[PDB]
Amino acid sequence: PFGEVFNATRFASVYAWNRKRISNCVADYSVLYNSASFSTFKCYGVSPTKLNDLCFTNVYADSFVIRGDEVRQIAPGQTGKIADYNYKLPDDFTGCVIAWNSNNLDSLYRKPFERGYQPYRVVVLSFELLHAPATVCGPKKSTNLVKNKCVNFNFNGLTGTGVLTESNKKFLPFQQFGRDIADTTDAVRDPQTLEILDITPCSFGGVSVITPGTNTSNQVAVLYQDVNCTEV
Amino acid sequence: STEKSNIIRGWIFGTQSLLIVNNATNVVIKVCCTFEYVSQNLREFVFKNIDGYFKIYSKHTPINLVRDLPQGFSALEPLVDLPIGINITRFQTLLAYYVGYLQPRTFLLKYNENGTITD
């Protein structure tokens, strides 16, 4: 219900900014981006196009009214009196700050995330990137699971290419991802069937060419290192 | 709390007040209302609030001796996480119970094939 937050008849004070949490619903950011009403749609840690496909655990909306000049102060890692006390943005908050002209309707002010002259309403969106089941997801269509074949997989906003096989791992219920020494995710739990699937990288091997001297002959023999003949 | 009778069924949290009551059947949790949480030997509970999220960890272990905490290693499974975002500086328990403060530490955790933290 982004509309409620954006079209809210009553807006909160700049210093007394209010935080509404959006969860458990598909969110389409395209509509907001399309609407020209918003003078500024700068996104600090994400790109608007990607927003549609990325899935975030929680979305937080902060509503406050500030003068046109004050809009700049909100920006992360910027020193402005509004920013100094009224509202503070931590660096790399991975959220989009959206401001629209509200002077016509409008016409009290005085640690991160702690609470010319025309006043413009400003709503700040913060995206939670923690690893958890993601309540908020962009508009997307699921496809049938494929196993035992190399496949490109996008699971809950996680993209990787690997073979998928059934996993004998005793995944604990609270657990959603299994990771190896590297950040890459070894095992993933299906967002629709709650099954544990092992991920195996697609076969990769060096190709070596066995060549008798070019002068003697041009015939060549090809060796695939550590690759079964069946695979290739 | 090392009680078989499990008389204790309440946990009061305050500087907004977070009331956690086992009550009957599903545990009911009240943060009043700014938010409302849906209803969900020795009993081990870990309570911490991080980023406005309240993570509870619970393990139940039979005890040969009630007086002394059993010597051995226990792994506490996370139960519920709540985005209450309420500051709590004091707590109370509603009817022996032992209370220990948590200090940040670096820990090397041994994971077995099962993935349990053995040690």
């Binding site: 791992k169 991802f177 | 226990s74 996370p78 032992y98 220990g100 955790l109 993935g115 933290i117």
Partner: peptide
Amino acid sequence: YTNSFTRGVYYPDKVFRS
């Protein structure tokens, strides 16, 4: 006062390591 000993370890994160 009762000694903590080894009691009180909890799983730090959801991700599974074996």
